[PDB]
Amino acid sequence: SCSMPLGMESKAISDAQITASSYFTNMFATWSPSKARLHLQGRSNAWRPQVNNPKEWLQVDFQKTMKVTGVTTQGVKSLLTSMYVKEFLISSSQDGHQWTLFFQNGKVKVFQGNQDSFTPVVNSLDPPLLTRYLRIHPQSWVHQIALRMEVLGCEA
């Protein structure tokens, strides 16, 4: 039951609720955090940080506690170039300042993400997170960090 899309694609999570450490901008496109939406089509249809390094993060504030049972991620093709995140970490917070990394067997879980530019990949959170804030941390990528995502779960 608890595997409903929490609103990235459908826009139930509005633009103001999605933030990042940085985003890439130029006069061809604006790859803002609010473009990080599963299946989004268009000119600048993903989040890209301004630099490619593992200190970058994308954040979603659900604005209330949600039960999170999984995440779906996708890359983008732009200007003939596929860009996707291959591996990533998840952290979560209830307040927004104190962040807990998602662990498995007593250390940080490294999620295996995408292997192409348009196939969505679902990763489960076991045990599920009860959380207001979720951050995704790119650890490895092909060509450029690029993300479109969905969060899966239910109300709590």
User: Resolution, rounded to a tenth of an Å?
Assistant: 2.1
Number of Cβ within 10 Å of residue 28's Cβ equals: 9
What is the widest separation between alpha-carbon atoms in the chain? Answer: 46
- The residues near 34 (Cβ < 8 Å, ≥ 6 apart) are 15, 16, 18, 47
Residue-range domain boundaries for the chain: 1-156
The CATH architecture of the domain made up of 1-156 is: Sandwich (2.60)
* DSSP assigned state of 33: G
Distance CA 61, CA 54 (A): 21
Residue pair 6/151 in contact by the 8 Å Cβ criterion:
yes
What method did the depositors use to determine the structure? X-ray
Distance CA 57, CA 49 (A): 8
Residue pair 46/31 in contact by the 8 Å Cβ criterion:
yes
